[PDB]
């Protein structure tokens, strides 16, 4: 499923991401935009054997089990395929653990490269939240 900017913002707000860990909703929408382009089925195979899955591109080496990543942990206790659903619940709950893992939102490279320090409020414009 390809989420609409405000449609996603609303969904994320429902799931408690707005100001979660001090990170405004705009930060989360911006991260999703640059990580997966709002596409829940987004997958990116890395060179180390791991793969990034879904709307927030969660990595299979430590957060979900895809059965093909060497020395992989399943910290979120879910199959990586669950992070590919149109429903964002699994991704949000797992992201909540990732952002609290000692690096804040820096865990998401696209967020750090295209959202960090910018006017993230723009990502929530026109939205009826
Ligand atoms: Na894993």
Swiss-Prot record:
Pfam families, A to Z: Lys (PF00062)
Would you tell me the Gene Ontology cellular component terms? cytoplasm; endoplasmic reticulum; extracellular space
- Catalytic residue positions: 35, 52
Primary localization: secreted
Query: What is this enzyme's catalytic activity, as reactions?
Result: Hydrolysis of (1->4)-beta-linkages between N-acetylmuramic acid and N-acetyl-D-glucosamine residues in a peptidoglycan and between N-acetyl-D-glucosamine residues in chitodextrins
Please list the residues that bind substrate: 101
Q: Which GO terms describe its biological process?
A: cell wall macromolecule catabolic process; defense response to bacterium; defense response to Gram-negative bacterium; defense response to Gram-positive bacterium; killing of cells of another organism
Query: Which cysteine-cysteine pairs are annotated as disulfide bonds in the entry?
Result: 6-127, 30-115, 64-80, 76-94
EC number assigned by the record:
3.2.1.17
For this protein, the record's SUPFAM superfamilies field holds: Lysozyme-like
SMART domains found in the cross-reference section: LYZ1
What's the superkingdom here?
Answer: Eukaryota
Q: Extract the InterPro entries matched here.
A: Glyco_hydro_22, Glyco_hydro_22_CS, Glyco_hydro_22_lys, Lysozyme-like_dom_sf
How would you summarize where this protein is expressed among tissues? Answer: In the egg white and polymorphonuclear leukocytes.
Any idea what job this protein has? Lysozymes have primarily a bacteriolytic function; those in tissues and body fluids are associated with the monocyte-macrophage system and enhance the activity of immunoagents. Has bacteriolytic activity against M.luteus.
What else does UniProt say about it? Answer: Lysozyme C is capable of both hydrolysis and transglycosylation; it also shows a slight esterase activity. It acts rapidly on both peptide-substituted and unsubstituted peptidoglycan, and slowly on chitin oligosaccharides.
- Protein name as annotated: Lysozyme C
Q: What is the originating organism of this protein?
A: Gallus gallus (Chicken)
Give the organism's phylogenetic lineage: Eukaryota, Metazoa, Chordata, Craniata, Vertebrata
